[PDB]
Specification:
homodimer, Transferase(Phosphotransferase), domain 1, Phosphorylase Kinase, domain 1, transferase, 2 domains, five-stranded antiparallel beta sheet, alpha+beta, kinase inhibitor, 7 strands, two-stranded antiparallel ribbon, ATP-binding
Chain lengths: 255, 256
Amino acid sequence: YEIQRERIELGRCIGEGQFGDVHQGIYMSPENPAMAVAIKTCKNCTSDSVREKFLQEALTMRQFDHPHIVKLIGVITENPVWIIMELCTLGELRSFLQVRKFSLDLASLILYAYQLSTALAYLESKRFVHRDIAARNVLVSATDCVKLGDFKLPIKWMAPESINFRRFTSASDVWMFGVCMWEILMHGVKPFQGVKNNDVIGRIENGERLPMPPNCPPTLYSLMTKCWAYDPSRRPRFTELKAQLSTILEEEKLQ
Amino acid sequence: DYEIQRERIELGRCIGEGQFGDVHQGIYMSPENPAMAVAIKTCKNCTSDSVREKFLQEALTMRQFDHPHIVKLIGVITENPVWIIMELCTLGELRSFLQVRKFSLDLASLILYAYQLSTALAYLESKRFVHRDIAARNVLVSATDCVKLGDFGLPIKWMAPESINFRRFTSASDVWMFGVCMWEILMHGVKPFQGVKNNDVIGRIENGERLPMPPNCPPTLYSLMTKCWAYDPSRRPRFTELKAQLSTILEEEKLQ
């Protein structure tokens, strides 16, 4: 998986990332003389602790093979350290939804939720807990294809047990996925806008929930609500979510 | 000291045409350290000695400064045609960056840019340097979380009333212009006084009118802008204070 620097041509900055900017580029590879790729960069990679955390993402990504999870291509482990990944040419999901707010139909939004559920059901099948499911970590490969893209605390996305006791489980992932579904159906608006992070848990405990997005099918909002059961053992698993989302999507396409 | 031989520079693509010269990207191969990406500003052959001198002055001015949010001078080529060699900010001009990436740039990024520019301007104020053209058009983007003041040398829509009325420029008039620059940032690169005639701006200022609060701009940040636009220059804050206040506003946004 080590790639010689000389085989990479660093191109335009596509977006921000957790450890540094993400660029598009070309990988002049033996299998392909001009492969379009994404290049994740890392500021402060001269620090051993930062470099270790950055590259741990690559190792994680390498364990998975799913159509809706971004694939690792390689790494450059000399300074400046780079991760080379599959390029998703339409970029970050939040910006895509905001820009295309009045161009994207409901069926497309439901499709993106369904596709992410397939990825998350696969991760569940491997007993992998993600801990940071949110629209900001989803990438858009085509107008009909999104991928999970990324493997201080995102309080506004977190299950109550995660906020209170730092417990992250398959059940807390479902809570977060509910918030991600809300975000999609809101065309990339963040949850709890105008609320301080410290006040979020109090509202959740008081039984308050994100409201039904405009134009959201009632069946879909109901599914969101199930993801936000206070008691984690009452939340659905991803097999159920995937199945229900498939039905909802087909219903919507029959419109 | 800062002279470089033209052979050490490989001129690349033009990234900005201009009246008396153009801006290019390129590569600098230093005898000590190969190899460096750079920005090259070129003076046209037909440019007057007077305007040529301004090019050299820009480099001379830039070389006096050492700050993380001010573009660095690498060197100059004094033999005609004059080229000025500077640090390369790869994401380019701030206005274009704000307009194009509007929907990828959340409020914390916009506040960060204002804060970073305030640190650059506090540093210039510490050197008793008066800039005279603070505007988003003169800011470059080095990374998605790093902007730099990039240029040191008719912008009536940005100018303090004393600068319009009297051609007086001081540290206080810089603060006025910085307020306008903040407004531009929070407006994702919209110019101030769009569709308004230069000759009408002063009439509106003296009448008490000011640019309106941008959508999603925190009221505390707009209050800062409004302080920058005190008609009396002696009532404007200095950049040390603006920097401190912007740090507070940035922290408050991060708590959300």
